[PDB]
Paper text:
Coxsackievirus A9 (CVA9) belongs to the Enterovirus genus, species Enterovirus B (EV-B) in the family Picornaviridae. Its positive-sense single-stranded RNA genome is ~7,500 bases long and encodes 4 structural proteins (VP1 to 4) and 7 nonstructural proteins (2A to C and 3A to D). During cell entry, enterovirus capsids undergo conformational changes leading to expansion, formation of large pores, externalization of VP1 N termini, and loss of the lipid factor from VP1.
For CVA9 in DPBS, the addition of RNase gave lower fluorescence values, indicating that either nucleic acids were present in the CVA9 preparation or vRNA was released from a small percentage of the virions and was degraded by the RNase (black dotted line). This indicated that 0.01% faf-[name] in DPBS efficiently converted CVA9 into expanded particles and only a small fraction of virions dissociated, releasing their vRNA. Compared to the intact virions, the two cryo-EM reconstructions of CVA9 virions treated in two different ways, 0.01% faf-[name] or ion composition, yielded RNA-containing A-particles expanded by approximately 4% in diameter.
Numbering used by the authors:
A (entry chain A), D (entry chain A): 54 to 127, 137 to 282
B (entry chain C), E (entry chain C): 3 to 175, 184 to 233
C (entry chain B): 14 to 27, 30 to 45, 50 to 260
Write the structure that this text describes.
């Protein structure tokens, strides 16, 4: 052991890590149209560890990048339409409709046997920074939703399997990796001390501050 | 003379490579100068935080953990409190600001600062012997033993804050750890019409500089 | 003639083989981690006198455990935690001109020694135990709780003839009679706990057995004199606000 | 024959060689969870030849690189998660747990039919050089482990086959190559003269110094 | 104008290519100046080492291999020892420092140095004829034959170290090899009260420079 100095504690290389955030499966043929494609609203409040890190700041400004790892099991090459609907775009409600054919939705076409698909979504928002915490209401009558604003909203990623007239009976599994880039953070905030109970609320149940020991004078 | 060399056709999940922009021809909303920009996680740890020194086995409420009791009646040689400096594993400092930042790393060292502030009546007077034991040393068992080592006689009458910068604070992943103890020297003396109890609060910081190396996940909130 | 060295005890003697061409030196020659150089430690801590008999095999002393019970140095090892020191070792034997023998005085840094029985563990009392000259033995060792102690492999499995890599001096009784080896501090961490780690092991190996003719003294006394030089420790006091 | 000079005896290009160090197999489907993934603590005391070379020095400072050659036998492309747990990280105890999803463990994702996976681990250690030999104890009571310190410790490589909901009944075989880079060495040490009996001890049985000949005067 | 040329999409297991860093954004502990840095394996071989000249068929113990015997009683023309210089295959030099370094290579040449040090009584005197035979030459069979060649008369009385730099030391992969022999010339003479035996030790080195080419594994420790 010796002292020296640090530079691994800078905000950018603290919160900037690739981490899995969503994993889902889909089957190209079945009786449920819900399961013929994958939907995924982008948010960073699903992975508990990742959430806790980001919630030590109130305002955050970053442009993310999303990498997909797709595998498939049962013959020829198979292609995937990895569409990105940005906020206030049209969303598909079923596999094959005009919402897939929309030309304002950036859509990757990646075929298997090649290095993973990737794209870098920029800083979308009409605000000047995403806000993790919001202490307000959706309307000024104050009877609406609590702790929700639309300026921290991010789009949806919809993945479907590009198929011919009659699909195969294949099934695929996707995994999504998410990594902030060029992070800036403003206003620090105390760490969490309770276990999360909701993915959107700040709800908690009271818990003791710290673990107990036999006596104040007793230390071993 | 090739880029098809082994180990350059994979997803390494820690890439520093640049990637295509999903939607170019889009203007971002320029940054605003919001108060309180943060540049390190070390700035967070250099803010003083109330440590819960008292945390007895049977604790009636959770707000008496920050209060070390001091009373009129108690012998002249009696121990007030004991601490073991190890701000990453000791229960006292585990959930403080300094504790939380440290637990995201696997190697760390530096010095910390402990301020002891008497929050009590404005008419009380007395003396205490805040004593420090080196890393290897055993905690003193009597006030006399404590006095031989490094000690500060903190006069409650003429001061109400005692600041102790402590060196040799390291990870240590039983254990060699320093100890801060405090002992009665005179007891608390009060004039008529004054309460017979007072308390001492305690604070902790990361002093001038600390150094942290190698990221790790917290062992607190479970997935 | 006689260059009388004084420190706080006197040793009269009359080459210096530096460990690797590096003299012992303070770490300060290069708050958070203050140090406390103790400058009263040096002085000649003369160890016990072993007898070089005709039928003997060799001897070794673990350092710094040999000086664990020696005065101020011994005390500081108990008090302080982290400490670093270099040593000036004077191994002198006294013999006539009718005595014939050869010795290899070698300082071996970090010598890990295997057990007598393969796949068994032994206690710390089998390598060092204050100031004692542990004795290498001829043939194998079959005592389970002992170190291997076979002279020809030096108890490390390296072959005894090749120990000449390490800073060594040969005391050929024919000519010279003194060996001065100035060992510097060699470790991969600036300073370390002096109980856990045995920094180096001094071995004296007779390569030619003593033949004393007839009606002459049957032993040659080999005395080891160790002076810890430039010993630094850790501060025990708090820093400023 | 003629004289000239050398430069093939420098430390860097002596110890810096690619050499196999571990080979293991795993089956994705069976009744033993131990055999559904590969574990491997990194050390250089398994290949006897490689060991002997490195043990001619006491302190060594190097940053290694690890290349993997993976083959598989029984249809579509198959991907491998080649995770690196560094010292004091969480280790998986079974296939599929949160330790695989940890974002602080550098994990390659390599799919077959491409040039071998590779990464270069840096010089990890809080010391100033790895120490081959240690002559001490783990505690100052000196009753602990002998000849073992934690400052020469290196992480583990865990390899698993990225699979869907139900794996295939494939089986794979891995081979690991290991090569020091930018080696520096301090304090030389005599070569070994006994056959190794343990992979962590220095234990040996006495052996004669050299082979014998008929007579001192006899040389042919 | 391509990097898809044949022979550039393989693992050649001796690559000098750079590769991605597993974890960047990690600070390494800077190097310390530890005594005795090594830069070549040749430095190791330039350190003198005790060679076991004596290694008779029936050897009672292993510590008498380093001792060449010399006694009072023995004819005036008698041979002390014989050696065949071939420090990579001859049993004498096989396991010395010089031997070990050499066996990791497949081509080597240069000169070696042999020092002969009499370790014995301080009252003994005598003479020896250390004789050298060229590579092609046969070892001499008598002291008279030996004396005609290259010989050094080493006086045990006025010297106790004889240093012989020997040239033409090559790999030779029977064999052409030099020979160093030593012969009695006067015998050992001692005054009363002195032992009737003494010994000669021997050392070997790699002299000013050697050159080694092409790596090879040792044929010693088996896998």
């Amino acid at each position: 052991k010796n002292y020296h100095s640090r530079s691994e504690s800078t905000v950018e290389n603290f919160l900037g890590r690739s981490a899995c955030v969503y994993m889902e499966e889909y089957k190209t043929t079945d009786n449920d149209v819900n399961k013929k494609f994958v939907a995924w609203p982008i948010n960073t409040k699903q992975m508990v560890q990742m959430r806790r890190k980001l919630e030590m700041f109130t305002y955050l400004r970053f442009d993310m990048e999303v990498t997909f790892v797709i595998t498939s099991r049962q013959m020829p090459v198979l292609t995937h339409q990895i569409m990105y609907v940005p906020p206030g775009g049209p969303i598909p409600a079923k596999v094959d409709d005009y919402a897939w054919q929309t030309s304002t939705n950036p859509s990757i076409f990646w075929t298997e046997g090649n290095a993973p698909a990737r794209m870098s979504i920029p800083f979308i928002s009409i605000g000047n920074a995403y806000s993790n915490f919001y202490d307000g209401w959706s309307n000024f009558d104050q009877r609406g939703s609590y702790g929700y604003n639309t300026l921290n909203n991010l789009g949806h990623i919809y993945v479907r399997h590009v198929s011919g007239s009659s699909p195969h009976p294949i099934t695929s599994t996707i995994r999504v990796y998410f990594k902030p880039k060029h992070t800036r953070a403003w206003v620090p905030r105390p760490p969490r001390l309770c276990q999360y109970k909701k993915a959107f609320s700040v709800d908690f149940t009271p818990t003791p501050i710290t673990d107990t020991r036999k006596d104040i004078n007793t230390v071993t | 003379p090739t880029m098809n060399t082994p180990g350059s056709t994979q997803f390494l999940t820690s890439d520093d490579f640049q990637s295509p922009c999903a939607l170019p021809q889009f203007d971002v909303t320029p940054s605003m100068n919001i108060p309180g920009e943060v540049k390190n996680l070390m700035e967070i740890a250099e803010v003083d935080s109330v440590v819960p020194v008292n945390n007895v086995q049977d604790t009636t409420d959770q707000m008496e953990m920050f209060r070390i009791p001091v009373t009129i009646n108690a012998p002249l040689q009696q121990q007030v409190f004991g601490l073991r400096l190890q701000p990453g594993l000791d229960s006292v400092f585990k959930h403080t600001l300094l504790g939380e930042i440290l637990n995201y790393y696997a190697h760390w060292s530096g010095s910390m600062k402990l301020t002891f502030v008497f929050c009590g009546s404005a008419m009380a007077t007395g003396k205490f012997l805040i004593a420090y034991s080196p890393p290897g040393a055993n905690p003193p068992k009597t006030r006399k033993d404590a006095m031989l080592g490094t000690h500060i006689i903190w006069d409650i009458g003429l001061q109400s804050s005692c600041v102790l910068c402590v060196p040799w604070i390291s990870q240590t992943h039983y254990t060699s750890a320093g100890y801060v103890t405090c002992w009665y020297q005179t007891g608390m003396i009060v004039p008529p019409g004054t309460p017979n109890s007072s308390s001492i609060m305690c604070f902790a910081s990361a002093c001038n500089d600390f150094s942290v190396r190698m990221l790790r996940d917290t062992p607190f909130i479970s997935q | 003639r006689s260059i009388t060295l004084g420190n706080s005890t006197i040793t009269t003697q009359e080459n210096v083989v530096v460990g690797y061409g590096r003299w012992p030196t303070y770490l300060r020659d290069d708050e958070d981690q203050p140090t406390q150089p103790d400058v009263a430690t040096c002085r000649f801590y003369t160890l016990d006198s072993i007898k070089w008999e005709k039928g003997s095999v060799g001897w070794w002393w673990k350092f710094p455990e040999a000086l664990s019970d020696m005065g101020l140095f011994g005390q500081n090892m108990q008090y302080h935690y982290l400490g670093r020191a270099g040593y000036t070792i004077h191994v002198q034997c006294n013999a006539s001109k009718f005595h014939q023998g050869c010795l290899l005085v070698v300082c071996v840094p970090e010598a890990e020694m295997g057990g007598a029985v393969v796949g068994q563990a032994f206690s710390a009392t089998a390598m060092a135990n204050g100031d004692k000259a542990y004795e290498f033995t001829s043939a194998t060792q079959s005592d389970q709780t002992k170190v291997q102690t076979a002279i020809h492999n030096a108890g490390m499995g390296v072959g005894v003839g090749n120990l000449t890599i390490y800073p060594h001096q040969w005391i050929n009784l024919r000519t010279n009679n003194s060996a001065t080896i100035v060992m510097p501090y060699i470790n991969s961490v600036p300073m370390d706990n002096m109980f856990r780690h045995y920094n180096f092991t001094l071995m004296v190996i007779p390569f030619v057995k003593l033949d004393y003719a007839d009606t002459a003294s049957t032993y040659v006394p080999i005395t080891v004199t160790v002076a810890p030089m430039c010993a630094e420790y850790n501060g025990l006091r708090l820093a400023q606000a």
